[PDB]
Design a protein around this ligand. Structure first.
Ligand code: CLA
Ligand code: CLA
Ligand code: CLA
Ligand code: CLA
Ligand code: CLA
Ligand code: CLA
Ligand code: CLA
Ligand code: LMG
Ligand code: LHG
Ligand code: BCR
Ligand code: PQN
Ligand code: SF4
Lengths: 742, 80, 142, 34, 87, 160, 160
């Protein structure tokens, strides 16, 4: 039954719908009458469910919007490869990366901003980049900037292809609703065709291109005299001199002599002592294994060839005595609602990005990634912020599924109906564990601050005071260090250096990684992390569960998603909406992720990042003060927020002064947020009425009536400036401090 | 509890009653409009005070008007 | 209009149980009982949260607030063509019939009901609070 | 300091006993049905 | 589930975890506790001697405490720290 | 004036010129003399030396910090600090205010007055953006003729 | 099949979960001194006091400020007995506020089944009066017996 359903020319490619701005909504198609029409024009621009009730045109809109997003990402990748090709020192950094900072952005000498073109090394001036593209291209085997320019113009070609496909799948041949409802085929071609063949193709690149070029880069060979990537494919003796297993020539693959591929497909583990990044024989065995495993997992579901699984048959057979008729109708949830699938996909992508952040500081995949501390801090911080934003958006589209796509007739006595039936128990027990975590982590911090203030260092929670050692983490770290000897034999070393297997890797005189200690301070800050994640889950899950109704408002689903309130009744119904719970969970994501990256920055500037002198002595950036100062808020304000901010505020008159400017302007955007968050619409409406009177006096009244921003819009503007200003504050402080001390 | 007052600017459009979630408002006969009906609030002790009627009133300025006064267990919207 | 009497023998919709139901306000202050006549066995969204199979005959549902009766009642007046009435039940045993008072819904006009809480002036002809200092009357109730 | 022991007396009463006097007498007073 | 003959059973007035056992102790244990806790019964009487007895018992060990028992009665045991500008 | 020495004879202003080139000369020491980033610092030094020789030749006043201070009182020596570029500004700012006011009058007498503000009529806009050149003669001309201000009987006023 | 509504009623805010109506849990919760509806409320208040009195010596002798001295038995037990005396006054002012002298019992008379039982005497002005004195005598004896078994007899334990 799975086959291609498209139909030809649904909408004509015309600019007459470009001229009318609010064509998608019936309310905005009448033209503007107030200034709130402009904000509802942008608010309802992407909301395709509010435009039409037909899921087919909604799915076509979403598919072509995906293609436009892919075009934007390919334009971005084209820019970052063109910046590597023309405006970088990638060949100079590739000659020796332990002394030259990665830089790929040149500013124009116009208004004094030419001081931002700093001395990054290699006879080059520019903004020192922290995005990690240089180490990524070193891991890709890129030797020259002509390859970067070729990848940039190839990405521009693919961006034109995504734009052409977005036009094609909305105006020339757009698919019908049952094409998008073939989720078994989509999972079969995403697991096997996308993630399986993608891992297999990158495994082939990391067998032929990344591995020999990166082996020659470990030998001190100059990249201008390293042979080009196709010379290893053509001259296979040149490939065989670096790995003798290539001399057999694909006969051990089909005769199952895979151990004869042990020269280039290894389960080593740990870091390259030359570079400080993971081995590419392990990253090529990794990709070959996750490819021979994603291609196996892509042959699971039933499309039209008889073999496979109907996943409705998987779900409807999963029913239990504590649930009864559970998992039934969830296929009808996840094939008739885009928001439910968006909630699941956003939760997995955000949690996965958090997995990426941890599995990159800890197991650095790229050569000279760990020893360039700016790249490590910026990559962890960026992926934590993206992951937190995507899990808050997961709860957002979960709540939009409840208020606009949850049909109660098709969901009786399943899992979702019963989760709604005891949502008071879920939110109340979550409330209890959040308050318990809040006292038992932050009140422990307050206790340490109080007894450190009262001159009682023995009455604290220190490593010298009452100890709170994380015995489960300290045991799982010993279990992961003492693994190769008995539970994981075939490993040369251990998975990560941060486990406890020794191997003090020194690359360029700077510490790549070592055994990470876990003490009372790590216990306290991990309980802060669990507390903040739990409270973010509490607001977000409360907005998902009470999106339909509440004890307060039993008709909340009729009010919608982006409604402000019901009114001042029932004591006041301000921020009853599920949107307002996403709005507050954005703040709790700020709190959670900001303490996560603060613990990260202080923990590895104190216990990981540093330098190694002669006779094996390790001097960290802030030597050993995480175990004693990160247990009090005064240490966090003092030895982290004051001592490490002594490079973002005196960076003026240097190349890092734009970080000082954006540090201060980020404080500005944050205090600007507090204008929108703390205020309300009616005050600003009457102030605008006075300004409209002054305009009426001088005959400069606009016909589009000036209005204050809406209450949902005022909260949106406030949380957008709060996240933008606070995140830009942490970005500026991080990227000034760890560039300055790195 | 809450005092809901109807003024003579009402056109009898009935949407204040339709927006009422606690059945406060009802349409009584009247002689001051084309629709020949005005709203009234007999069950104003059941008023939560949500002002959904004021949001649905098209008359400028409003004909239905809710004044938040003494608040009891009806007008607090509690179930415990 | 003779008010309908609560039968207390019609059964409940098939519901698996919810935590949004009757708390101790039902036990000591009041609770609300909504009674309606159904064409067939359908599934409706519970205003306390959840879904229940409603019966093929008359149905009885116990709710805690008057707003839960209208949120349910307007749900089964627009999605379903079902006439409904609800009551107010006190812990001493008195059942107070609440809606519709005349038997016809308050959106439709009836000649029996009278105008109460209606001002013959507008908002702009309300008196200032400075000339009504220290009185039980306020700017709108006179 | 003239009398060092009145710090040891009045700070426990006005810091512990007097809030326990005042808040318990107010909680009786604010929850009187009258 | 509405009955009009039993208003408590149709509203949630249930002793969910209660028991109707009359007694499970013996007479020797019961007569000891009511004799000793017989002057602690009345709420107005118990609130009087708990405030008056509680004010005395915090002022006694607040004043009879020693240097090792509490540091505020120990006093300074070193030279005072002089501030800046000779103050 | 105001206890400030002129910047041409200020020892602190010449000290800031000395320590700015010396900062840029030490940046030049780690580059090749014919290299491309060294040409940017060499252009930065000539931009700095042009700047300090421009500030001293305009009669700027330098304080004890070695920094040029502006006298905005309306001094006959100091017209180009505030008075001359202020009159240049207010002419340009009144140009923005006159062509935005005249556009709203031109679109208020239209069929759909609100569609001409989201979609600005460029032939109607550009024919009055030229007309904003002579705007003090047209603003006070409308002020004297009474067309600049609206009478308070036709102005929406919130009640007391 | 496992989850039921509370006594068959789906519209009361609760469920008959295994954590609520187990054969073991509903046996336990029905024998705890707070749910004995026919025992006199001074006697069952002595057991609510003995329990809470005992348990509170532990976090006050092992975590308090005077935990590193030889007075750690005396400091923590009087600190544990201090929380008994405060909570007795919290029990005193609760019964003054909630229950009036001469009123009825604010208690559910009906059991899980349809059988009619006598009213619970604890939720009265005189029942909470004898409950408060039961907590005071039981709590002060529960602290003193835990102090006797820890710092008078000094029984061997891994932590004390
Ligand atoms: C084996 C075939 C296969 C593969 C490789 C993919 C791959 C992809 N699908 Mg697709 N899909 C397929 C078949 C396949 N699809 C089937 C059978 C169904 C119908 C049931 C769908 C329906 C479906 C929809 C509705 C959507 C996708 C989307 C996606 C994209 C994932 C999003 C992203 O950023 O990934 C990484 C992206 C890339 C690596 C870019 C690669 C682009 C190149 C040109 C290949 C894509 C063309 C084609 C699918 C395979 C040609 C192979 C060619 C290289 C030889 C990606 C392009 C999503 C998307 O973004 O929409 C555009 C989306 O939601 N798929
Ligand atoms: C999708 C990825 C991919 C692709 C396109 C290539 C491409 C190539 N491989 Mg293969 N190869 C890959 C994955 C890949 N391989 C992986 C992951 C391994 C580990 C098993 C190898 C290990 C390998 C060896 C051992 C050799 C090739 C060889 C070949 C060449 C001839 C086979 C052919 O084109 O079919 C060709 C250049 C042969 C060759 O010419 O080497 C350059 C050769 O002897 N391959
Ligand atoms: C995979 C990603 C994804 C998907 C598909 C969508 C899709 C959607 N979102 Mg969103 N959402 C997600 C993730 C995503 N979101 C995340 C990351 C969050 C957390 C912020 C949420 C939270 C969420 C809520 C709270 C709601 C939606 C809603 C919307 C809908 C339309 C919004 C619109 O018209 O755009 C409008 C676009 C803008 C107004 C652009 C503003 C961009 C941000 C806010 C400010 C600028 C940030 C920028 C980086 C700073 C530059 C500053 C510089 C210019 C000076 C649409 C269904 C809305 C809805 O009604 O859903 C049906 C809505 O109510 N989203
Ligand atoms: C530093 C500022 C601050 C503090 C103290 C609080 C405090 C609280 N927030 Mg938070 N929050 C804040 C800013 C603050 N918030 C802001 C910026 C927003 C607006 C977006 C929110 C909005 C808000 C949401 C929306 C939620 C919370 C919740 C909570 C609670 C978390 C549980 C907890 O830690 O209990 C322990 C209490 C504390 C740590 C407070 C300090 C008390 C000390 C330790 C006790 C000792 C004092 C002593 C008794 C005095 C005598 C707690 C009461 C959550 C909640 O109520 O459910 C759990 C909730 O869902 N917050
Ligand atoms: C409002 C005025 C004022 C304030 C801020 C305080 C503040 C203080 N007094 Mg007090 N004191 C006051 C009036 C004031 N005093 C006067 C007028 C007398 C003279 C009889 C005293 C005699 C006194 C003694 C003997 C002691 C203190 C002590 C203290 C400290 C602990 C609190 C305490 O035990 O109270 C005790 C308070 C009293 C005995 C009488 C208070 C009468 C005031 C006027 C009540 C004001 C109520 C206020 C207006 C309501 C708000 C604290 C620093 C102790 C100390 O030095 O700490 C080390 C202590 O030993 N006070
Ligand atoms: C001005 C206010 C006031 C004062 C006088 C004290 C006094 C005290 N605090 Mg406390 N505290 C207060 C406010 C107060 N607190 C508040 C507002 C906070 C909340 C943020 C705290 C939080 C706090 C904690 C968390 C703890 C202290 C503890 C202590 C003790 C430290 C001295 C010591 O080592 O004794 C050591 C202990 C003893 C000598 C035990 C004496 C206990 C006596 C015998 C109680 C007797 C009955 C009592 C008087 C009945 C009161 C009746 C009522 C009328 C007040 C001491 C009893 C510590 C302690 O040990 O508490 C007892 C401790 O664990 N304080
Ligand atoms: C079309 C041109 C036009 C005209 C002639 C004026 C002129 C007037 N406005 Mg302004 N204003 C306009 C555009 C205009 N405005 C627009 C686009 C906005 C939104 C940003 C406002 C927002 C606004 C505020 C917030 C305030 C005024 C006020 C004023 C007065 C003093 C000037 C001032 O405060 O600085 C100008 C103020 C700005 C915020 C700058 C906006 C000017 C923009 C850049 C011009 C755009 C024109 C272009 C064709 C589009 C004066 C009556 C004040 C008043 O009440 O009267 C005393 C006052 O409080 N206006
Ligand atoms: C390649 C990028 C250009 C694609 C243009 C496609 C398109 O819209 O043109 C296809 C358009 C379709 O023509 C549409 O016809 C409509 C009446 O049916 C209205 O007149 C629209 O304004 C007009 O765009 O053909 C044109 O007449 C070309 C002019 C508009 C394109 C201008 C490009 C700038
Ligand atoms: C995480 C694990 C928590 C244990 C939970 C677990 O073991 O679930 C056990 C139980 C499984 O129920 P059933 O046997 O009905 O499940 C059949 C499944 O296929 C669900 O359809 O799940 C629940 O009833 C949820 C209870 C959560 C109880 C609160 C926990 C928080
Ligand atoms: C131009 C102009 C002007 C000026 C302006 C001003 C006044 C300023 C302000 C400003 C300030 C005072 C501040 C601000 C700040 C800024 C910021 C803050 C921004 C940002 C942006 C962005 C885009 C971001 C980015 C990011 C993200 C998103 C994430 C991560 C981080 C980062 C940072 C990277 C005026 C009006 C005169 C006139 C007209 C024109
Ligand atoms: C300031 C503020 C406003 C007023 C905000 C407004 C009116 C937005 C202003 C947007 C711009 C500055 C005006 C429109 C600009 C036009 C594009 C014209 C261009 C003119 C210059 C910007 C070039 C609210 O409406 C509000 C509502 C609820 C809570 C808090 C607040 C709040 O704090
Ligand atoms: S909504 Fe307003 S105008 Fe319409 S009937 Fe009600 S009071 Fe009258």
């Amino acid at each position: 039954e799975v086959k291609i359903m498209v139909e030809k020319d649904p909408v004509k490619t015309s600019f007459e719908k470009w001229a009318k701005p609010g064509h998608f909504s019936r309310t905005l198609a009448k033209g503007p009458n107030t200034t709130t029409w402009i904000w509802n024009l942008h608010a309802d621009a992407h909301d395709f469910d509010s435009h039409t009730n037909d899921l087919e045109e909604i799915s076509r809109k979403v598919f072509s919007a995906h293609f436009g997003q892919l075009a934007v990402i390919f334009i971005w990748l084209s820019g970052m490869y063109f910046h590597g090709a023309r405006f970088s020192n990638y060949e100079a950094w590739l000659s020796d990366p332990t002394h030259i900072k990665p830089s790929a952005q040149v500013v124009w000498p116009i208004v004094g901003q030419k001081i931002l073109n700093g001395d990054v090394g290699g006879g080059f001036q520019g903004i020192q980049i922290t995005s990690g593209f240089f180490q990524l291209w070193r891991a890709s085997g890129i030797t020259s900037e002509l390859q970067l320019y070729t990848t940039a113009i190839g990405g521009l070609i693919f961006a034109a292809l995504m734009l052409f496909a977005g036009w094609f799948h909305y105006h020339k041949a757009a698919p019908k609703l049952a094409w998008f409802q073939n989720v078994e085929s989509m999972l079969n071609h995403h697991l096997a065709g996308l993630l399986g063949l993608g891992s297999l193709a990158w495994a082939g690149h990391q067998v032929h291109v990344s591995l020999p070029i990166n082996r020659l880069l470990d030998a001190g060979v100059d990249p201008k005299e390293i042979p080009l990537p196709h010379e290893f494919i053509l001259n296979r003796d040149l490939l065989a001199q670096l790995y003798p297993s290539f001399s057999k020539g694909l006969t051990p693959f089909f005769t199952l002599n895979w151990s004869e591929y042990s020269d280039f497909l290894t389960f080593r583990g740990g870091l390259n002592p030359v570079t400080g990044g993971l081995w590419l024989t392990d990253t090529a065995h990794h990709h070959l294994a996750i490819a021979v495993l994603f291609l196996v997992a892509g042959h699971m579901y039933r499309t039209n060839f008889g073999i496979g699984h109907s996943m409705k048959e998987i779900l409807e057979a999963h029913k239990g005595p504590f649930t009864g008729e559970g998992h039934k109708g969830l296929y009808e949830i996840l094939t008739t609602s885009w928001h439910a699938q968006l909630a699941i996909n956003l939760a997995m992508l955000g949690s996965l990005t958090i997995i990426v952040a941890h599995h990159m500081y800890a197991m650095p995949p790229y050569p000279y990634l760990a020893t360039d501390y700016a790249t490590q801090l910026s990559l962890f911080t960026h992926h934590m912020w993206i992951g937190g934003f995507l899990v808050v958006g997961a709860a957002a589209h979960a709540a939009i599924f409840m208020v606009r796509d949850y049909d109660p007739t098709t969901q009786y006595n399943n899992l979702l109906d019963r989760v709604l039936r005891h949502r008071d128990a879920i939110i109340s027990h979550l409330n209890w564990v959040c308050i318990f975590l809040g006292f038992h982590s932050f009140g422990l911090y307050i206790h340490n601050d109080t007894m450190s203030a009262l001159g009682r260092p023995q009455d604290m929670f220190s490593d010298t005071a009452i100890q709170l050692q994380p015995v489960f983490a300290q045991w799982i770290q010993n279990t992961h260090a003492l693994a190769p000897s008995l539970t994981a034999p075939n490993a040369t070393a251990s998975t990560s250096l941060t486990w406890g297997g020794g191997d003090l890797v020194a690359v360029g005189g700077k510490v790549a990684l070592l055994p990470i200690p876990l003490g009372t301070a790590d216990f306290l800050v991990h309980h802060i992390h669990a507390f903040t994640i739990h409270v973010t889950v509490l607001i977000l899950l409360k907005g998902v569960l009470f999106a339909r109704s509440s004890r307060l408002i039993p008709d909340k689903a009729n009010l919608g998603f982006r409604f402000p309130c019901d009114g001042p009744g029932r004591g006041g119904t301000c921020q009853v909406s599920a949107w307002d719970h996403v709005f507050l969970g954005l703040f709790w994501m700020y709190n959670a992720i900001s303490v996560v990256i603060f613990h990260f920055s202080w923990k590895m500037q104190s216990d990981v990042w540093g330098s190694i002198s002669d006779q094996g002595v390790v001097t960290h950036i802030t030597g050993g003060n995480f175990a004693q100062s990160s247990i009090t808020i005064n240490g966090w304000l003092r030895d982290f927020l004051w001592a490490q901010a002594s490079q973002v505020i005196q960076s003026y008159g240097s190349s890092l002064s734009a970080y000082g400017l954006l540090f201060l302007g980020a404080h500005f955007v944050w205090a600007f947020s507090l204008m929108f968050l703390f205020s309300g619409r009616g005050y600003w409406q009457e102030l605008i009425e006075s300004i409209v009177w002054a305009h009426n006096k001088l005959k400069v009244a606009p016909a589009i009536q000036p209005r204050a921003l809406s209450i949902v819009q005022g909260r949106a503007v406030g949380v957008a400036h709060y996240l933008l200003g606070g995140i830009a504050t942490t970005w500026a402080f991080f990227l000034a401090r760890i560039i300055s001390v790195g | 509890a809450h005092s809901v007052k109807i003024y003579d600017t009402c056109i009898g459009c009935t949407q204040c009653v339709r927006a009422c979630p606690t059945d406060v408002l009802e349409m009584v006969p009247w002689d001051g409009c084309k629709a020949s009906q005005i709203a009234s609030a007999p069950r104003t002790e059941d008023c939560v005070g949500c002002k959904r009627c004021e949001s649905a009133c098209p008359t400028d300025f409003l004909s239905v008007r809710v004044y938040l006064g003494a608040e009891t267990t009806r007008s607090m919207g509690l179930a415990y | 209009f003779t008010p309908p009497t609560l039968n207390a023998d019609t059964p409940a919709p098939i519901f698996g149980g919810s935590t949004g139901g009757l708390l101790r306000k039902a036990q000591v202050e009041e609770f609300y009982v909504i009674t309606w006549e159904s064409p067939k066995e359908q599934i409706f969204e519970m205003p306390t949260g959840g879904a229940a199979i409603m019966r093929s005959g008359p149905n009885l549902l116990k709710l805690a607030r008057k707003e839960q009766c209208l949120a349910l009642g307007a749900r089964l007046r627009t999605k379903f063509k079902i006439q409904y009435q609800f009551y107010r039940v006190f812990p001493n045993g008195e059942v107070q019939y609440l809606h519709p008072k005349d038997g016809v819904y308050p959106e439709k006009v009836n000649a029996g009901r009278t105008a109460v809480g209606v001002n013959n002036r507008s908002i702009g002809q309300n008196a200032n609070p400075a000339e009504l200092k220290f009185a039980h009357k306020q700017a709108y109730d006179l | 300091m003239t009398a060092s022991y009145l710090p040891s007396i009045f700070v426990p009463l006005i810091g512990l006993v007097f809030p326990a006097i005042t808040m318990a007498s107010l909680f009786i007073y604010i929850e009187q049905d009258e | 589930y509405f009955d009009l003959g039993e208003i408590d059973n149709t509203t949630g007035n249930w002793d969910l975890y209660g028991n109707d056992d009359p007694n499970r102790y013996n007479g020797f244990q019961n007569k000891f506790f009511e004799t000793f806790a017989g002057a602690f019964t009345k709420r107005g009487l118990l609130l009087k001697f708990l405030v008056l007895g509680g004010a005395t018992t915090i002022g006694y060990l607040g004043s009879t405490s020693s240097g090792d028992l509490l540091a505020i009665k120990n006093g300074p045991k070193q030279a005072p720290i002089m501030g800046p500008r000779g103050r | 004036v105001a206890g400030l020495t002129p910047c041409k004879e200020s020892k602190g202003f010449a000290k800031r010129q000395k320590q700015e080139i010396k900062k840029l000369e030490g940046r030049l020491k780690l580059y090749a003399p014919d290299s491309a980033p060294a040409l940017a610092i060499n252009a930065t030094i000539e931009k700095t030396k042009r700047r300090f020789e421009f500030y001293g030749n305009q009669g700027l006043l330098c304080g004890t910090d070695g920094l040029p201070h502006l006298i905005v009182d309306g001094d006959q020596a100091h017209l180009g600090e505030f008075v001359y570029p202020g009159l240049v500004f207010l002419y340009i700012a009144g140009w923005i205010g006159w062509v935005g006011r005249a556009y709203l009058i031109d679109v208020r007498t239209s069929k759909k007055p609100t569609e001409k503000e989201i979609i600005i009529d460029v032939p109607l806009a550009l024919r009055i953006m030229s007309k904003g050149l002579t705007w003090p003669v047209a603003a006070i001309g409308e002020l004297r003729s009474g067309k600049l201000v609206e009478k308070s009987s036709n102005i929406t006023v919130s009640p007391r | 099949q496992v989850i039921e509504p509370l006594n068959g009623d789906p519209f009361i805010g609760g469920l008959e979960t295994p954590v609520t109506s187990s054969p073991l849990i509903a046996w336990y919760l029905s024998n705890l001194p707070a749910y004995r509806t026919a025992v006199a409320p001074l006697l069952r208040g002595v057991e609510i006091g003995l329990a809470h009195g005992y348990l509170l010596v532990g976090p006050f002798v092992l975590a308090g400020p005077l935990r590193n001295s030889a007075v750690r038995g005396e400091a923590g037990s009087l600190a544990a007995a201090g929380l008994v005396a405060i909570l007795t006054m919290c029990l005193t002012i609760y019964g003054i506020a909630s229950f009036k002298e001469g009123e009825a019992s604010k208690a559910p008379s009906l059991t899980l089944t349809g059988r009619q039982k006598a009213a619970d005497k604890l939720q009265t002005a005189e029942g909470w009066a004898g409950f408060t004195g039961g907590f005071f005598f039981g709590g002060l004896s529960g602290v003193a017996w835990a102090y006797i078994l820890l710092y008078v007899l000094n029984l061997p334990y891994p932590v004390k």
